[PDB]
Amino acid sequence: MGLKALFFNVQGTLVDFYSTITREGEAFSAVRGFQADWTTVTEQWRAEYRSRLDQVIKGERPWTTTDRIYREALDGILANHPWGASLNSADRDELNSLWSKLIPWDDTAPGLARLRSKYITSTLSNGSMASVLRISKLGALPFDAILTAELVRSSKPDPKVYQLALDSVGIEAHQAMMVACHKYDLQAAKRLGFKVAFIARPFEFGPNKKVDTKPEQYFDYYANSVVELAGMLGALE
Amino acid sequence: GLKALFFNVQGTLVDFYSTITREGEAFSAVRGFQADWTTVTEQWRAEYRSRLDQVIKGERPWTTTDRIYREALDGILANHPWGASLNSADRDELNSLWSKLIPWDDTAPGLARLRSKYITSTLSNGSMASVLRISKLGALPFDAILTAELVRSSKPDPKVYQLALDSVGIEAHQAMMVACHKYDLQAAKRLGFKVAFIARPFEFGPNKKVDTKPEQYFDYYANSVVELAGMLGAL
Ligand SMILES: [Ca+2]
């Protein structure tokens, strides 16, 4: 009846998407010999993705994998950039694959290994199963299971996604903990009876952008890294 | 070329016969009664398959495989006078062995070698909760855990194989079904998967003859996961 399973958000919470897109974007453009502002490109790509995602959620657009939403959002924002028209379909697939390569924060893999020695661990994020699987494999991020909202064709904070986690691992809400750096996610899981752990990610949107990392009253745990979370949960190995 | 391998679990990777017999023998010892546990595996699977088909044929609303295994245990225990000396709590605990199945000796090394070259995942009929526990307890590494529970069905339903392709994001010809059961490889093959058969001559113990013969439609035929790893260049 204690804590039995931890479920992890992925983007930002475990992986530094900002550094992935910007650093690999810059290499991509530098070799082709054109100037590009990958900070702006990254922010626009995310905004267009989330706008189209919101249209999928509302039913305005037909359901599709997040991989395709990113790929189509990429076509949209590239029209804002004169060099974008020079990028062929294979060039755009290459850029889009970066979202399946998001690199871990330097604390993520060792903290995940420690937590897995004491708990059942699983992802629980909104991205496609295919991309979360590859992110975990490429980052050598250990998990007992890979779950995403794709499996119920939805998105957090939809209660179905949290219930998916409880049904798949076979535990009750009070035996589960949602781990994220996004407060909407923890608020929703807390209302459904989960324990919640907040991981402060002050560089989620790059080294220079202020992010909301302040503690909240309803957090069971407040940590600055997955390693620190493991320490406070007494998780070794 | 090949991108991902999907593994059946019971029999293919883990020895449920020995798990049943040795945990059963432990249960009978503490409670102070004797029982021929060598035949219980056969009985339990039979009762289970019958009750499962009640879910499959729609005679019963969908329920977890672990629940069905728990009810099948009531079924077989009513056939033995010693069954009554296991109360509901004992049967609950006994039924939990299906989340604790012991790997064959070749399973973990073979799985680790294959994962260094390919994406790897379970794809079996049991509950997500049990397969996850089996793999965790047995230190079986995978990139993902999938079971037919995620589409509330069972192999050979094409939805289960499509779940595997949709989840890993690949095409059928880039995927390989790995199993010691021919109905499973037959269905996956017809859907364009590659297939690999692992012969498991002791799946039902040392005293029963099981079908381990090769078939022409098998892309690979092996006697262990380690042997399959060698065939796939995952040395
Ligand atoms: Ca895993």
Residue numbers in the entry:
A (entry chain A): 40 to 276
B (entry chain B): 41 to 275
What is the paper's account of this structure, in its own sentences?
Microbial epoxide hydrolases, cis-epoxysuccinate hydrolases (CESHs), have been utilized for commercial production of enantiomerically pure L(+)- and D(−)-tartaric acids for decades. Studies have shown that both RhCESH[L] and KlCESH[L] adopt a two-step catalytic reaction mechanism by 18O-labeling studies.
A product molecule, L-TA, was found in the substrate-binding site of KlCESH[L]-D48N, which was present in the crystallizing solutions at a concentration of 0.2 M. One carboxyl group of the L-TA is fixed by N165 and Y223, and the other carboxyl group is mainly fixed by the nitrogen atom of the main chain of V49 and Q50. The distances between the L-TA two hydroxyl oxygen atoms and the side chain oxygen atom of N48 are ∼2.5 to 3.0 Å, supporting that D48 is the nucleophilic residue in KlCESH[L]. However, D48 has similar distances to the two hydroxyl oxygen atoms of L-TA, making it difficult to determine which hydroxyl group is derived from the oxygen atom of the epoxy during the reaction. However, the binding of non-catalytic ligands, including sulfate ions and products L-TA, did not cause significant structural changes.
